[PDB]
C-alpha cells in the first residue's frame, strides 16, 4: 500500500493499550513504514491460506476483540526489530531490512505459532491451552529469531542442530522480553499459556526439568518424535545460557554469572559467525568459547563462565 504514515491506538491480547504504526489510504492499514522496508500484519480469517488480507481498519482504532492479536503481532514485531537494530546493529532478519510479515487468526483453535520460511503465523489458541499466541512477546521474538537463524547459521531443523535452533529462539526471545521490560522472566510463553492456570509456562530456561525437559546432556532424548526432540533437548542449551547469564551451581558445577547483555553478545556472535547448518552441541560450545574469546580475551572471566556453563550441562 502507498499512503500516509500515521499512528493508531488499540488494545492487545492481554487488554493493554498501545499505539501502533499504521498507513492511511482510504482505510487505515497495519503497515508500519518506520522500520526497514516495513512491518505488515494480515488477517488469515480463520483459514490456512496465507498470508491473507493486509489488515484494514476504518477508523485507526483497534479495540475490537477480533483486533487484539493483530495489534500485538504488529507491535511486538516492531519491538523485536528494534532490539536487533539497537542492540546488535542488525537491520531486520536478513540484515538488509527485509519486510516483516505476520498473519493472525490462522485456522481455528490453532495452538501454535511459527515462522514458515517467509513470514510469521499465529493461531488464536483454543482458549484453554492458549490464548492468541501473538500476546506473548517472547513467542513473537522466538519466531522472528528463527528468521534470523535461517539467514545466518541456517541450522537444520532436526536432532542437535534443530535443538540449537530452538534454544537460540528461546534465548533471544527471552532477551527481547527483558529489553522491552515486559514482566521479564526466564520462562517461555507464560503470558499466553493456560489462561486458567497461574504460574506455569511452556518451557523453563531456569529449570527445564520443571516441565520434564532435560537439563543435562546425559538426559538427552534420543528418539524420533519432535524431529528428534528439537523442543526437548533445547532444554540443555537453555540451561547453559541461563547459567552463563545468571550463574549458579548445577550438578555440582559452579558458574559465575556474566549477565544478559554479554550472553546476547556472545550468542549472537556465535550464531552469525561460527555456527553452520549441521553444528552439534559440542560444536556450539566451541563456537561460544571462540566468540567470548574474540570479544573478551582468552583469559577473561567471560570465557571461563562459558566453559563452566557447558561443563555443568555436560556438553564437552
Ligand atoms: Ca517469558
Ligand atoms: Ca498459565
Ligand atoms: Mn477500528
Ligand atoms: Mn521455534
Ligand atoms: Mn514474562
Task: Give a written overview of the molecule.
The protein is an alpha+beta fold and 316 residues long. It is built from 8 helices and 15 strands. The chain folds into 2 domains: 149 residues, Elastase, domain 1; 161 residues, Neutral Protease Domain 2 (Neutral Protease, domain 2, Orthogonal Bundle). Helix content is 38%, strand content 17%. The strands form 4 sheets. Strands 4, 5, 6, 9, 10 and 11 form a 6-stranded mixed β-sheet that branches. A 5-stranded mixed β-sheet has the order 7-3-2-1-8. α2 crosses α3 and α7 runs antiparallel to α8. The chain is globular. The structure holds calcium ion (2 copies) and manganese (II) ion (3 copies). It is found in: Secreted. It is an enzyme of class 3 (hydrolase). Keywords: Calcium, Hydrolase, Metal-binding, Metalloprotease, Protease, Secreted, Signal, Zinc, Zymogen.
Characteristic key phrases:
monomer; 8 helices; 316 residues; Neutral Protease, domain 2; binds manganese (II) ion; zymogen; Elastase, domain 1; signal; 38% helix; globular; hydrolase; alpha+beta
In short:
This protein has 8 helices and 15 strands. By secondary structure, the protein is α+β, with helices and mostly antiparallel strands. It is globular.
Strand and helix map with partners:
Elements: E1 4-11, E2 17-25, E3 27-29, E4 31-32, E5 39-43, E6 53-54, E7 56-57, E8 61-62, H1 68-88, E9 100-104, E10 113-115, E11 120-122, H2 137-151, H3 159-180, E12 187-188, E13 203-204, H4 225-229, H5 234-246, E14 248-250, E15 253-255, H6 260-274, H7 281-296, H8 301-312
Helix pairs in contact: 1-2, 2-3, 3-5, 3-6, 5-6, 5-8, 6-7, 7-8
The protein binds calcium ion (2 copies) and manganese (II) ion (3 copies).
Amino acid at each position: 500500500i502507498t499512503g500516509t504514515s500515521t499512528v493508531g491506538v488499540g488494545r492487545g491480547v492481554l487488554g493493554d493499550q498501545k499505539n501502533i504504526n499504521t498507513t492511511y489510504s482510504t482505510y487505515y492499514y497495519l503497515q508500519d513504514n518506520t522500520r526497514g522496508d516495513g512491518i505488515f500484519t494480515y488477517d488469515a480469517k480463520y483459514r490456512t491460506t496465507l498470508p491473507g488480507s493486509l489488515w484494514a481498519d476504518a477508523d485507526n482504532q483497534f479495540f475490537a476483540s477480533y483486533d487484539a492479536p493483530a495489534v500485538d503481532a504488529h507491535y511486538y514485531a516492531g519491538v523485536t526489530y528494534d532490539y536487533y537494530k539497537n542492540v546488535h546493529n542488525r537491520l531486520s532478519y536478513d540484515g538488509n531490512n527485509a519486510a516483516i510479515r505476520s498473519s493472525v487468526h490462522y485456522s481455528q483453535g490453532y495452538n501454535n505459532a511459527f515462522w514458515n520460511g517467509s513470514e510469521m503465523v499465529y493461531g488464536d489458541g483454543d482458549g484453554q491451552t492458549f490464548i492468541p499466541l501473538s500476546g506473548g512477546i517472547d513467542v513473537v521474538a522466538h519466531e522472528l529469531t528463527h528468521a534470523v537463524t535461517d539467514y545466518t547459521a541456517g541450522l537444520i531443523y532436526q536432532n542437535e542442530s534443530g535443538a540449537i535452533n530452538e534454544a537460540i529462539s528461546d534465548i533471544f526471545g527471552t532477551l527481547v522480553e527483558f529489553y522491552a521490560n515486559k514482566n521479564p522472566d526466564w520462562e517461555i510463553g507464560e503470558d499466553v499459556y493456560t489462561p486458567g492456570i497461574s504460574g506455569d509456562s511452556l518451557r523453563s530456561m531456569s529449570d527445564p526439568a520443571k516441565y520434564g525437559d532435560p537439563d543435562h546432556y546425559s538426559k538427552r532424548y534420543t528418539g524420533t518424535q519432535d524431529n528428534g526432540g528439537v523442543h526437548i533437548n533445547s532444554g540443555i542449551i537453555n540451561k547453559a545460557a541461563y547459567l552463563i547469564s545468571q550463574g549458579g551451581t548445577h550438578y555440582g558445577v559452579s558458574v559465575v554469572g556474566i549477565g544478559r547483555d554479554k550472553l546476547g553478545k556472545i550468542f549472537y556472535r556465535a550464531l552469525t559467525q561460527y555456527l553452520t547448518p549441521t553444528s552439534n552441541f559440542s560444536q556450539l560450545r566451541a563456537a561460544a568459547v571462540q566468540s567470548a574469546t574474540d570479544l573478551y580475551g582468552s583469559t577473561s572471566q567471560e570465557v571461563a563462565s562459558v566453559k563452566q556453563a557447558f561443563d555443568a550441562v555436560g556438553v564437552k
